[PDB]
PDB file of C-alpha atoms and ligand atoms in Angstrom:
ATOM      1  CA  UNK A 170      67.506  83.034 -15.743  1.00 30.92           C
ATOM      2  CA  UNK A 171      66.719  85.587 -18.611  1.00 30.77           C
ATOM      3  CA  UNK A 172      63.026  86.384 -18.624  1.00 35.71           C
ATOM      4  CA  UNK A 173      61.049  86.707 -21.873  1.00 33.79           C
ATOM      5  CA  UNK A 174      60.506  90.246 -23.096  1.00 34.45           C
ATOM      6  CA  UNK A 175      57.989  91.785 -23.481  1.00 32.44           C
ATOM      7  CA  UNK A 176      57.350  90.657 -19.760  1.00 32.51           C
ATOM      8  CA  UNK A 177      54.241  91.349 -17.843  1.00 33.67           C
ATOM      9  CA  UNK A 178      54.293  91.525 -14.066  1.00 35.99           C
ATOM     10  CA  UNK A 179      50.995  91.656 -12.199  1.00 33.04           C
ATOM     11  CA  UNK A 180      50.676  94.097  -9.469  1.00 35.82           C
ATOM     12  CA  UNK A 181      48.051  92.528  -7.289  1.00 36.51           C
ATOM     13  CA  UNK A 182      45.630  95.113  -6.167  1.00 33.04           C
ATOM     14  CA  UNK A 183      47.542  97.811  -7.911  1.00 30.77           C
ATOM     15  CA  UNK A 184      50.287 100.105  -6.505  1.00 28.84           C
ATOM     16  CA  UNK A 185      50.276 101.899  -3.164  1.00 29.64           C
ATOM     17  CA  UNK A 186      52.833 104.137  -1.343  1.00 30.53           C
ATOM     18  CA  UNK A 187      55.849 102.237   0.147  1.00 33.03           C
ATOM     19  CA  UNK A 188      55.602  99.731  -2.780  1.00 33.00           C
ATOM     20  CA  UNK A 189      59.025  99.189  -4.262  1.00 32.57           C
ATOM     21  CA  UNK A 190      59.489  97.462  -7.777  1.00 34.18           C
ATOM     22  CA  UNK A 191      62.910  96.312  -8.725  1.00 35.27           C
ATOM     23  CA  UNK A 192      63.866  95.400 -12.331  1.00 34.72           C
ATOM     24  CA  UNK A 193      67.355  93.836 -12.945  1.00 37.36           C
ATOM     25  CA  UNK A 194      68.587  93.437 -16.482  1.00 38.03           C
ATOM     26  CA  UNK A 195      71.358  94.039 -18.956  1.00 38.53           C
ATOM     27  CA  UNK A 196      71.171  96.428 -21.888  1.00 40.55           C
ATOM     28  CA  UNK A 197      71.791  94.715 -25.250  1.00 41.03           C
ATOM     29  CA  UNK A 198      74.618  96.090 -27.333  1.00 38.73           C
ATOM     30  CA  UNK A 199      73.532  98.867 -29.645  1.00 38.45           C
ATOM     31  CA  UNK A 200      70.176  99.180 -27.682  1.00 37.31           C
ATOM     32  CA  UNK A 201      67.647 101.596 -29.256  1.00 35.66           C
ATOM     33  CA  UNK A 202      64.995 101.771 -26.360  1.00 34.40           C
ATOM     34  CA  UNK A 203      63.758 100.489 -23.021  1.00 34.03           C
ATOM     35  CA  UNK A 204      60.191 100.887 -21.762  1.00 34.87           C
ATOM     36  CA  UNK A 205      58.415 100.326 -18.405  1.00 34.42           C
ATOM     37  CA  UNK A 206      54.544 100.591 -18.649  1.00 36.02           C
ATOM     38  CA  UNK A 207      52.683 100.754 -15.441  1.00 34.56           C
ATOM     39  CA  UNK A 208      49.115 100.027 -16.822  1.00 33.57           C
ATOM     40  CA  UNK A 209      45.660 100.636 -15.523  1.00 32.98           C
ATOM     41  CA  UNK A 210      43.824  98.475 -18.006  1.00 34.49           C
ATOM     42  CA  UNK A 211      44.498  99.945 -21.467  1.00 32.63           C
ATOM     43  CA  UNK A 212      45.744 103.262 -19.908  1.00 32.89           C
ATOM     44  CA  UNK A 213      49.351 103.642 -19.093  1.00 32.07           C
ATOM     45  CA  UNK A 214      49.733 105.316 -15.755  1.00 33.22           C
ATOM     46  CA  UNK A 215      53.435 105.643 -15.846  1.00 37.64           C
ATOM     47  CA  UNK A 216      55.470 105.158 -19.136  1.00 38.66           C
ATOM     48  CA  UNK A 217      59.253 105.319 -18.499  1.00 37.60           C
ATOM     49  CA  UNK A 218      61.041 105.213 -21.813  1.00 37.22           C
ATOM     50  CA  UNK A 219      64.793 105.473 -22.181  1.00 38.24           C
ATOM     51  CA  UNK A 220      65.623 106.424 -25.822  1.00 39.78           C
ATOM     52  CA  UNK A 221      69.253 105.663 -26.832  1.00 44.01           C
ATOM     53  CA  UNK A 222      69.316 107.586 -30.189  1.00 44.87           C
ATOM     54  CA  UNK A 223      66.744 110.376 -30.652  1.00 45.84           C
ATOM     55  CA  UNK A 224      68.426 112.671 -33.082  1.00 47.09           C
ATOM     56  CA  UNK A 225      71.793 111.333 -31.745  1.00 51.30           C
ATOM     57  CA  UNK A 226      70.958 112.144 -28.113  1.00 55.05           C
ATOM     58  CA  UNK A 227      70.035 109.895 -25.175  1.00 54.89           C
ATOM     59  CA  UNK A 228      66.887 110.929 -23.374  1.00 53.30           C
ATOM     60  CA  UNK A 229      64.401 109.330 -20.941  1.00 55.15           C
ATOM     61  CA  UNK A 230      60.676 110.101 -21.969  1.00 55.65           C
ATOM     62  CA  UNK A 231      58.013 109.794 -19.405  1.00 57.24           C
ATOM     63  CA  UNK A 232      54.254 109.988 -20.103  1.00 56.64           C
ATOM     64  CA  UNK A 233      50.771 108.861 -19.426  1.00 57.24           C
ATOM     65  CA  UNK A 234      48.222 107.272 -21.899  1.00 59.45           C
ATOM     66  CA  UNK A 235      44.563 107.883 -21.354  1.00 57.00           C
ATOM     67  CA  UNK A 236      41.943 106.468 -23.630  1.00 55.70           C
ATOM     68  CA  UNK A 237      44.734 105.685 -26.288  1.00 56.67           C
ATOM     69  CA  UNK A 238      46.151 109.369 -26.209  1.00 56.58           C
ATOM     70  CA  UNK A 239      49.600 110.181 -24.999  1.00 59.09           C
ATOM     71  CA  UNK A 240      49.876 113.247 -22.791  1.00 58.87           C
ATOM     72  CA  UNK A 241      52.389 115.910 -22.079  1.00 56.97           C
ATOM     73  CA  UNK A 242      55.842 114.389 -22.013  1.00 57.53           C
ATOM     74  CA  UNK A 243      58.355 114.847 -19.165  1.00 57.64           C
ATOM     75  CA  UNK A 244      61.876 114.609 -20.234  1.00 58.05           C
ATOM     76  CA  UNK A 245      65.154 113.896 -18.282  1.00 58.34           C
ATOM     77  CA  UNK A 246      68.567 114.264 -19.889  1.00 58.90           C
ATOM     78  CA  UNK A 247      70.435 112.452 -17.157  1.00 62.16           C
ATOM     79  CA  UNK A 248      70.776 109.095 -18.779  1.00 59.89           C
ATOM     80  CA  UNK A 249      72.447 106.458 -16.630  1.00 62.27           C
ATOM     81  CA  UNK A 250      71.949 103.382 -19.059  1.00 64.48           C
ATOM     82  CA  UNK A 251      74.714 102.125 -21.239  1.00 65.57           C
ATOM     83  CA  UNK A 252      74.518  99.561 -24.046  1.00 66.10           C
ATOM     84  CA  UNK A 253      76.085  96.287 -22.865  1.00 64.12           C
ATOM     85  CA  UNK A 254      75.785  97.052 -19.176  1.00 64.25           C
ATOM     86  CA  UNK A 255      73.814  95.653 -16.306  1.00 59.85           C
ATOM     87  CA  UNK A 256      71.337  97.952 -14.643  1.00 57.45           C
ATOM     88  CA  UNK A 257      69.059  98.109 -11.690  1.00 53.60           C
ATOM     89  CA  UNK A 258      65.878 100.192 -11.793  1.00 53.83           C
ATOM     90  CA  UNK A 259      64.120 100.877  -8.649  1.00 51.95           C
ATOM     91  CA  UNK A 260      60.532 102.405  -8.656  1.00 51.02           C
ATOM     92  CA  UNK A 261      59.292 103.511  -5.378  1.00 51.88           C
ATOM     93  CA  UNK A 262      55.665 104.578  -5.122  1.00 49.84           C
ATOM     94  CA  UNK A 263      55.195 107.666  -2.943  1.00 46.65           C
ATOM     95  CA  UNK A 264      52.057 109.446  -2.116  1.00 45.09           C
ATOM     96  CA  UNK A 265      52.458 112.174  -4.834  1.00 45.47           C
ATOM     97  CA  UNK A 266      54.826 110.490  -7.364  1.00 45.86           C
ATOM     98  CA  UNK A 267      56.707 107.497  -8.676  1.00 44.30           C
ATOM     99  CA  UNK A 268      60.427 107.864  -7.583  1.00 43.72           C
ATOM    100  CA  UNK A 269      62.921 106.247  -9.865  1.00 44.43           C
ATOM    101  CA  UNK A 270      66.512 105.374  -9.003  1.00 43.94           C
ATOM    102  CA  UNK A 271      68.846 103.539 -11.324  1.00 46.31           C
ATOM    103  CA  UNK A 272      72.017 101.759  -9.932  1.00 45.56           C
ATOM    104  CA  UNK A 273      71.253 103.234  -6.507  1.00 40.77           C
ATOM    105  CA  UNK A 274      71.324 106.780  -7.704  1.00 41.85           C
ATOM    106  CA  UNK A 275      68.203 108.890  -7.713  1.00 41.42           C
ATOM    107  CA  UNK A 276      67.054 109.762 -11.197  1.00 41.26           C
ATOM    108  CA  UNK A 277      63.638 111.215 -11.521  1.00 41.45           C
ATOM    109  CA  UNK A 278      60.114 111.569 -10.130  1.00 40.57           C
ATOM    110  CA  UNK A 279      56.837 111.510 -11.846  1.00 39.27           C
ATOM    111  CA  UNK A 280      53.776 112.942 -10.327  1.00 37.70           C
ATOM    112  CA  UNK A 281      50.589 110.778 -10.153  1.00 42.54           C
ATOM    113  CA  UNK A 282      48.248 111.672 -13.097  1.00 42.55           C
ATOM    114  CA  UNK A 283      46.291 108.546 -12.724  1.00 46.15           C
ATOM    115  CA  UNK A 284      44.644 108.689  -9.252  1.00 45.40           C
ATOM    116  CA  UNK A 285      43.351 105.247  -8.761  1.00 45.89           C
ATOM    117  CA  UNK A 286      46.599 103.707  -7.813  1.00 43.07           C
ATOM    118  CA  UNK A 287      45.035 100.492  -6.611  1.00 43.01           C
ATOM    119  CA  UNK A 288      43.928  99.915 -10.151  1.00 40.39           C
ATOM    120  CA  UNK A 289      47.412 100.172 -11.772  1.00 42.75           C
ATOM    121  CA  UNK A 290      47.648  96.378 -11.591  1.00 43.83           C
ATOM    122  CA  UNK A 291      50.276  95.420 -14.193  1.00 42.29           C
ATOM    123  CA  UNK A 292      53.805  96.467 -15.204  1.00 40.76           C
ATOM    124  CA  UNK A 293      54.941  95.853 -18.761  1.00 40.52           C
ATOM    125  CA  UNK A 294      58.684  95.616 -19.324  1.00 40.86           C
ATOM    126  CA  UNK A 295      60.007  95.840 -22.897  1.00 39.83           C
ATOM    127  CA  UNK A 296      62.794  96.986 -25.215  1.00 38.89           C
ATOM    128  CA  UNK A 297      66.401  96.008 -25.953  1.00 38.26           C
ATOM    129  CA  UNK A 298      67.319  94.321 -22.717  1.00 38.49           C
ATOM    130  CA  UNK A 299      68.127  90.926 -21.314  1.00 44.72           C
ATOM    131  CA  UNK A 300      65.698  90.823 -18.345  1.00 46.65           C
ATOM    132  CA  UNK A 301      67.098  89.024 -15.304  1.00 42.43           C
ATOM    133  CA  UNK A 302      64.489  89.807 -12.617  1.00 42.01           C
ATOM    134  CA  UNK A 303      61.313  91.733 -11.940  1.00 43.54           C
ATOM    135  CA  UNK A 304      59.763  91.701  -8.524  1.00 46.50           C
ATOM    136  CA  UNK A 305      58.206  94.117  -5.875  1.00 44.63           C
ATOM    137  CA  UNK A 306      58.269  94.381  -2.064  1.00 49.73           C
ATOM    138  CA  UNK A 307      56.639  96.580   0.520  1.00 49.50           C
ATOM    139  CA  UNK A 308      59.108  98.833   2.488  1.00 47.59           C
TER     140      UNK A 308
HETATM  141  C1  P8G B 446      64.538 122.106 -27.356  1.00 47.20           C
HETATM  142  O1  P8G B 446      63.507 121.945 -28.220  1.00 47.20           O
HETATM  143  C2  P8G B 446      63.530 120.693 -28.979  1.00 47.20           C
HETATM  144  O2  P8G B 446      64.789 120.622 -29.646  1.00 47.20           O
HETATM  145  C3  P8G B 446      64.937 119.216 -30.387  1.00 47.20           C
HETATM  146  C4  P8G B 446      66.258 118.988 -31.042  1.00 47.20           C
HETATM  147  O3  P8G B 446      66.186 117.774 -31.713  1.00 47.20           O
HETATM  148  C5  P8G B 446      63.795 119.106 -31.356  1.00 47.20           C
HETATM  149  O4  P8G B 446      63.776 120.230 -32.282  1.00 47.20           O
HETATM  150  C6  P8G B 446      62.385 119.160 -30.599  1.00 47.20           C
HETATM  151  O5  P8G B 446      61.137 119.090 -31.416  1.00 47.20           O
HETATM  152  C7  P8G B 446      61.401 117.886 -32.332  1.00 47.20           C
HETATM  153  C8  P8G B 446      61.046 116.584 -31.424  1.00 47.20           C
HETATM  154  C9  P8G B 446      60.588 115.498 -32.051  1.00 47.20           C
HETATM  155  N1  P8G B 446      60.511 114.581 -31.052  1.00 47.20           N
HETATM  156  C10 P8G B 446      59.933 113.335 -31.186  1.00 47.20           C
HETATM  157  O6  P8G B 446      60.899 112.407 -31.825  1.00 47.20           O
HETATM  158  C11 P8G B 446      60.457 111.052 -31.882  1.00 47.20           C
HETATM  159  C12 P8G B 446      61.266 109.898 -32.446  1.00 47.20           C
HETATM  160  O7  P8G B 446      62.403 109.790 -31.457  1.00 47.20           O
HETATM  161  C13 P8G B 446      59.005 110.997 -32.735  1.00 47.20           C
HETATM  162  O8  P8G B 446      59.226 111.527 -34.094  1.00 47.20           O
HETATM  163  C14 P8G B 446      58.092 111.936 -31.909  1.00 47.20           C
HETATM  164  O9  P8G B 446      56.781 111.987 -32.611  1.00 47.20           O
HETATM  165  C15 P8G B 446      56.254 110.656 -32.761  1.00 47.20           C
HETATM  166  C16 P8G B 446      56.233 109.642 -31.570  1.00 47.20           C
HETATM  167  C17 P8G B 446      55.318 109.547 -30.653  1.00 47.20           C
HETATM  168  N2  P8G B 446      55.828 108.526 -29.898  1.00 47.20           N
HETATM  169  C18 P8G B 446      55.337 107.892 -28.732  1.00 47.20           C
HETATM  170  O10 P8G B 446      55.721 108.797 -27.561  1.00 47.20           O
HETATM  171  C19 P8G B 446      55.059 108.216 -26.256  1.00 47.20           C
HETATM  172  C20 P8G B 446      55.568 108.962 -25.181  1.00 47.20           C
HETATM  173  O11 P8G B 446      54.889 110.240 -25.251  1.00 47.20           O
HETATM  174  C21 P8G B 446      55.594 106.701 -26.216  1.00 47.20           C
HETATM  175  O12 P8G B 446      56.989 106.591 -26.051  1.00 47.20           O
HETATM  176  C22 P8G B 446      55.232 105.836 -27.450  1.00 47.20           C
HETATM  177  O13 P8G B 446      55.792 104.520 -27.533  1.00 47.20           O
HETATM  178  C23 P8G B 446      55.947 106.621 -28.522  1.00 47.20           C
HETATM  179  O14 P8G B 446      55.438 105.856 -29.684  1.00 47.20           O
HETATM  180  N3  P8G B 446      56.951 108.255 -30.377  1.00 47.20           N
HETATM  181  N4  P8G B 446      57.195 108.778 -31.389  1.00 47.20           N
HETATM  182  C24 P8G B 446      58.625 113.314 -31.744  1.00 47.20           C
HETATM  183  O15 P8G B 446      57.779 114.052 -31.026  1.00 47.20           O
HETATM  184  N5  P8G B 446      60.860 115.252 -29.995  1.00 47.20           N
HETATM  185  N6  P8G B 446      61.210 116.372 -30.328  1.00 47.20           N
HETATM  186  C25 P8G B 446      62.330 120.537 -29.825  1.00 47.20           C
HETATM  187  O16 P8G B 446      61.120 120.554 -29.031  1.00 47.20           O
HETATM  188 CL1   CL B 447      42.365 107.796 -12.165  1.00 46.03          CL
END
């Protein structure tokens, strides 16, 4: 039913273009944050971080963490999440970027900074959600 957050989903042999990762959940009421962390060991290859109240604004912050240092942030002000509401996040790995759609609407893409895609072998899912489902498939 509801998975335990923080949740770790192993990605056997890392990611690869045409790999589709689907996260189903519901945002808690008065949520503060969501985070998806595609990890290469201790490094975070792709950090996807909806923030519900940063100086009274809603923003999605994306970044990469290498040897414990966060890089240059990429910010998107389109913010499809709402507290209390069910969502679907789809992360499709493409040759040059992660492509993210929420609720079947394209949201953003994030260019690969970590190059060893087949070593990005785990997805951490955390934040103020009830997590229903997390899975992957090759399309
Ligand atoms: C148009 O221009 C802009 O107009 C704006 C109008 O409000 C502001 O004036 C802008 O400058 C101020 C400003 C401040 N911040 C951030 O605000 C934050 C709290 O919401 C923190 O204080 C941030 O610094 C500490 C911090 C670090 N991290 C880590 O970031 C990682 C991803 O990179 C992961 O998410 C980690 O998990 C997370 O810990 N988190 N917090 C701070 O950098 N963003 N912008 C200005 O540029
Ligand atoms: Cl790399």
